[PDB]
Symmetry: C3
Subunit: 326 residues, 3 copies
Amino acid sequence: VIFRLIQLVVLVYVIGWVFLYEKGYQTSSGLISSVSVKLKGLAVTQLPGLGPQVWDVADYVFPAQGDNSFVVMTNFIVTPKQTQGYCAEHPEGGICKEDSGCTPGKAKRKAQGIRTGKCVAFNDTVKTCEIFGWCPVEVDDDIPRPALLREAENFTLFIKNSISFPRFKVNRRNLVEEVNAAHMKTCLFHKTLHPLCPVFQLGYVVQESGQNFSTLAEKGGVVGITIDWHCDLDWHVRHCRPIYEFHGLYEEKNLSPGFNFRFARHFVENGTNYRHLFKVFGIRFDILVDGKAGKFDIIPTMTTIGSGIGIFGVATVLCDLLLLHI
Amino acid sequence: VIFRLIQLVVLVYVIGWVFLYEKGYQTSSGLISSVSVKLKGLAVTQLPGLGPQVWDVADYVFPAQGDNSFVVMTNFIVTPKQTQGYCAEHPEGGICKEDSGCTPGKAKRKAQGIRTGKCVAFNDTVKTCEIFGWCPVEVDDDIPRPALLREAENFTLFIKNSISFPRFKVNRRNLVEEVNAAHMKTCLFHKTLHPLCPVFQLGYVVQESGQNFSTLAEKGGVVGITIDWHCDLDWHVRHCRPIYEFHGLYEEKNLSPGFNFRFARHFVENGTNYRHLFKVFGIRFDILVDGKAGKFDIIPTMTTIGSGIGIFGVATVLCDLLLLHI
Amino acid sequence: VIFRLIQLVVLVYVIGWVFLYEKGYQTSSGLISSVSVKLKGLAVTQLPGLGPQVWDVADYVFPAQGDNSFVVMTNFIVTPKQTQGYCAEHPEGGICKEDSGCTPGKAKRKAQGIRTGKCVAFNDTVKTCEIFGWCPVEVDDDIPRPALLREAENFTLFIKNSISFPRFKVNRRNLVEEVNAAHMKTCLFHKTLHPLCPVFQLGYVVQESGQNFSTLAEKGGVVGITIDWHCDLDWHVRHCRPIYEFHGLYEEKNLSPGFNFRFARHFVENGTNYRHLFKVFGIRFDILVDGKAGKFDIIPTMTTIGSGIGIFGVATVLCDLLLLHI
Ligand SMILES: Nc1ncnc2c1ncn2[C@@H]1O[C@H](COP(=O)(O)OP(=O)(O)OP(=O)(O)O)[C@@H](O)[C@H]1O
Ligand SMILES: Nc1ncnc2c1ncn2[C@@H]1O[C@H](COP(=O)(O)OP(=O)(O)OP(=O)(O)O)[C@@H](O)[C@H]1O
Ligand SMILES: Nc1ncnc2c1ncn2[C@@H]1O[C@H](COP(=O)(O)OP(=O)(O)OP(=O)(O)O)[C@@H](O)[C@H]1O
Ligand SMILES: *[C@@H]1O[C@H](CO)[C@@H](O)[C@H](O)[C@H]1NC(C)=O
Ligand SMILES: *[C@@H]1O[C@H](CO)[C@@H](O)[C@H](O)[C@H]1NC(C)=O
Ligand SMILES: *[C@@H]1O[C@H](CO)[C@@H](O)[C@H](O)[C@H]1NC(C)=O
Ligand SMILES: *[C@@H]1O[C@H](CO)[C@@H](O)[C@H](O)[C@H]1NC(C)=O
Ligand SMILES: *[C@@H]1O[C@H](CO)[C@@H](O)[C@H](O)[C@H]1NC(C)=O
Ligand SMILES: *[C@@H]1O[C@H](CO)[C@@H](O)[C@H](O)[C@H]1NC(C)=O
Ligand SMILES: *[C@@H]1O[C@H](CO)[C@@H](O)[C@H](O)[C@H]1NC(C)=O
Ligand SMILES: *[C@@H]1O[C@H](CO)[C@@H](O)[C@H](O)[C@H]1NC(C)=O
Ligand SMILES: *[C@@H]1O[C@H](CO)[C@@H](O)[C@H](O)[C@H]1NC(C)=O
Ligand SMILES: [Mg+2]
Ligand SMILES: [Mg+2]
Ligand SMILES: [Mg+2]
């Protein structure tokens, strides 16, 4: 009788686990995703010598059109009115005492310009090789300790994620039926309180990634936002909801901490070409959307049943051999 | 004799389905893809007060260098010569009667600037809190009903998709051998007539995604272009061709319809910093390239044969048990 | 005795191959990746009529903030001070003898502007239809044979790849423990000599992709950089290292060789709107990061053991049938 008992255990396993837990009766399809991101919020940076400068979405989001991976500027160093000319290079490229030390040409690594070959004063104490390039050279030694856009903590990120399961011809948007005009007006995403609001406060996103916004704001950082669409299309499509998880690890001990990049805003003034060089420290938000849809299909159902019978057949042989040797 | 009959059925299944349909004799490798997109076409927008403005690829493609996900501008709202200053904020941030209602600071959500705390006239009828920020504030209430770049319907998208199967060291470009200089000159992609022309008319792409370009043009939209490379490398490499499928669902009832973003073109005029704010309504084309290559390999062939023998062994046991109990 | 001999062979197979080589005792999880790219190096282009122009990271990287897919400019054609006006279109849009040939409107394909309908002289020998658009029209017929930014060969690409295995809560950066401040100062990645230095010389990357930088520099190109994280988390996390492989095939015979795009730098001079049109020929670097982590888990271990017993049970039946029929 114990022989058939195992058969029931195998039958329970197949039905309970393979046929039900793993949804063996369902076929699976990946998704194709499109992510639209809009940032709302504004930061003001009043440099002691420069009047209050405002930074809206058009100025602190890179790229402006948005992408799966986009950068929100949280701190910057600006070299205003850079012009192509001769000037002393940054001392990070070497410090010279006389023109003999400087060699005409271009530095082998991290070149700042075309070295003329004569030493010139970078400042009163330090003399550096004269280069041809964007002048004055960028001085990014002093990152602002309170991030100039630390107010980006309260910026709101609206993630509009349109997914499709092409095999099942099911289109879903992360703005699920629950999300309405009233929610989009005042809702801020919370992992438990508002798990479906597609408006994310950047500080909350960074905090839920296991990171500190104040630390990430100063020198930039990385936050990974995963949107998971695990949907059972055998149920009403309204249950096909996204799951948001935030990822990131900022170790100050780790070398090259944070994220930064340089971009320039070229302009012409007084019939001369100038540019504003910005070393933008910012949090790169990588929005990775993954998921699978499961819809009942007869072909996986039959193969799962066939696999269950095959498992049953193997188990009966194993029980037969077991009883013989024991 | 029925015992061996089932054996043939299992043998037919293994050979016919596992060994041939599923190509069990082949090993499989994913692909690494690079997508190059070039947009050709031009739109002219003659505002009643502003002379005819032309929009070529450098101006309506975001990003200009292109990407797997890029935006073609189909409609825009422009705030010309925005300057950082004091002005009335947009009424969407609140309408005030007196300065008492306004509070100095920054709005908690969708902040437009630094509220000075005194109510000022946004226009004759409506007074809004004075803010410091980009002035005049954007008025995006009236989206142009005929899209300013509705001529983007006839824009041509050239998708240059270079894929590689690194395991098989096979490199393919969507410009297949069939595609030649004469085709690239006049061909427009059609799902059946010209299924290999890599030049796609945007209107056709939107139409084949199940969407209406006129609707998507006004408020933006999303079109997913999937390039599938299902190649059997046992055949000549010339048969490794891409398959293009277009995806998208635009529901006007759905909240936040379409896609839009704001970008600015900063410039200096009369020794003052200005910017042109554009609320760009556009169709975000997400080009997702997937696929797998199958090349004959002895190791999968042996395992498939071994699996077939294993299936044969299980089937014989099942037939044995069947005949006993029946 | 040969019966049990096969049992050992199956036991060796399960333990040796399934349980050990394929790490059946381990569960597997994909990774979520964020790629930060910084380009260092400078190129100078001294046009015979235009003074030496320098190109630093802010000017030759598209997008400036970087992405998984980014473009490093290696050659460009510039149309300076384009303004919206009437002028002769490029002869690629058609050559006319009289105004009768030109038709007012817009060309059906590759439109350059709004044709006024009167033929005008493009140059002394050739007359083309007058259009309204960006003037003077781009003349990209003569790509510079020595690429203007062929010095991009010695540009250094710093790939900062932060990955996470969310199931295992393991965060890794391609700046592995071996990589320190001293390495990041002077190291250049080599496939064998320095396989962990995250600073890549562009010439080396193109060369290791099977391509010639001089060829790719002139007309652009594509290089795929794959970062593979195949990590066994049963071992210390310091062994979770990335593997870099470079992919690309440049066939001059292939149609549409290379990669190029057009972007504009709009500016206002003398109270008039102008733009600098750049046809940027560049190498698009697609950084695809993939990999899987394997950590010992009891559930895969039991199923692998159960599968091994199942394989053992099937093998015993096959040996039984074999001995009967033979
Ligand atoms: N592409 C590159 N080639 C060579 N060195 C690089 C490159 N990118 C960064 N580095 C160097 O690596 C170190 C850390 O890089 P990281 O970008 O995090 O620092 P940083 O202080 O912002 O650098 P920098 O101001 O030099 O761009 C610095 O010494 C930086 O100069
Ligand atoms: N990041 C965000 N934070 C908060 N609200 C947002 C955000 N992005 C969009 N919204 C709001 O969500 C609603 C719909 O968003 P959507 O971007 O589709 O509309 P819109 O009319 O283009 O918005 P807007 O002009 O305010 O950017 C609007 O009320 C908009 O203000
Ligand atoms: N979107 C498009 N629609 C139509 N033709 C296109 C498109 N993109 C490129 N082409 C044409 O395809 C051919 C090769 O394309 P490719 O971009 O490699 O060449 P090109 O010389 O840089 O082109 P162009 O200067 O015309 O942009 C050219 O004749 C080009 O005009
Ligand atoms: C001069 O420059 C060096 C290197 O950047 C810096 O350490 C030093 O403090 C500077 N001195 C002054 C007086 O600014
Ligand atoms: C964000 O939270 C509130 C705004 O409602 C404010 O009190 C706080 O200071 C803000 N923090 C920053 C860093 O701007
Ligand atoms: C973040 O860092 C700041 C300063 O480094 C510190 O005051 C604060 O307690 C940290 N944590 C949070 C949650 O802000
Ligand atoms: C004033 O602004 C409000 C809010 O934008 C608008 O509804 C109204 O039509 C405007 N009135 C005039 C006369 O422009
Ligand atoms: C696109 O098709 C033709 C151009 O050949 C033209 O008749 C039609 O009006 C165009 N449509 C738009 C919206 O520009
Ligand atoms: C698209 O919409 C327009 C106006 O909304 C309508 O006239 C047209 O019939 C629709 N369909 C197509 C295919 O253009
Ligand atoms: C005139 O333009 C045509 C077409 O671009 C070109 O082939 C020819 O060489 C040009 N002639 C001169 C004198 O520039
Ligand atoms: C790159 O290599 C060295 C620089 O160290 C130089 O001799 C060589 O000419 C450079 N090549 C180019 C194309 O700039
Ligand atoms: C690359 O091309 C140039 C010119 O086309 C040639 O001189 C050189 O030998 C080629 N190979 C390498 C490795 O530079
Ligand atoms: Mg620095
Ligand atoms: Mg609005
Ligand atoms: Mg051309």
